[PDB]
Write an enzyme that holds these catalytic residues in place. Sequence first.
Site, PDB file in Angstrom:
ATOM      1  N   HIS A  12       2.987  -0.821   3.371  1.00  0.00           N
ATOM      2  CA  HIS A  12       3.717  -0.276   2.222  1.00  0.00           C
ATOM      3  C   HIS A  12       3.431   1.175   1.862  1.00  0.00           C
ATOM      4  CE1 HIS A  12       5.306  -4.233   1.456  1.00  0.00           C
ATOM      5  NE2 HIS A  12       4.091  -4.741   1.347  1.00  0.00           N
ATOM      6  N   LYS A  39      10.841  -8.527   9.579  1.00  0.00           N
ATOM      7  CA  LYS A  39      10.683  -8.699   8.132  1.00  0.00           C
ATOM      8  C   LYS A  39      12.031  -8.452   7.468  1.00  0.00           C
ATOM      9  CE  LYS A  39       7.175  -7.745   4.534  1.00  0.00           C
ATOM     10  NZ  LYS A  39       7.903  -7.085   3.401  1.00  0.00           N
ATOM     11  N   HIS A 113      -1.114  -5.954  -2.629  1.00  0.00           N
ATOM     12  CA  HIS A 113       0.178  -6.631  -2.571  1.00  0.00           C
ATOM     13  C   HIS A 113       1.196  -5.702  -3.206  1.00  0.00           C
ATOM     14  CE1 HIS A 113       3.263  -9.741  -3.193  1.00  0.00           C
ATOM     15  NE2 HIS A 113       3.270  -9.454  -4.485  1.00  0.00           N
TER      16      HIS A 113
END
Length: 121
Positions: A12, A39, A113
């Site tokens: 990310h 993904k 996350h």
Amino acid sequence: DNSRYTHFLTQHYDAKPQGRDDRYCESIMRRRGLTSPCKDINTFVHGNKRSIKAICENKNGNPHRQNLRISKSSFQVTTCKLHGGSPWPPCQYRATAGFRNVVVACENGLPVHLDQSIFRR
């Protein structure tokens, strides 16, 4: 361990993106090992790391929902969304560049996350 943060960075984080078009997504999704299987949606945050880690504190974050923190500042981001009928490569992606705050979960002052729900739009 401390590998969850490193894994957050791999999935990310991209400090200085090149273009942020479809070809950008198709390349980086490969580079970061996210294409087997493809993904379905994945978002990269741009800029420096320190601003993102800051979300884990009051300096740049507020608690959010039940397990999350939401940034005070806005970030340049790019969302890569899977196109085509197949879960398997070649993975075709549509790129959507954006500029807004982000939601993460933090452990020990580090993001581990990225909440993708806010970019399904």
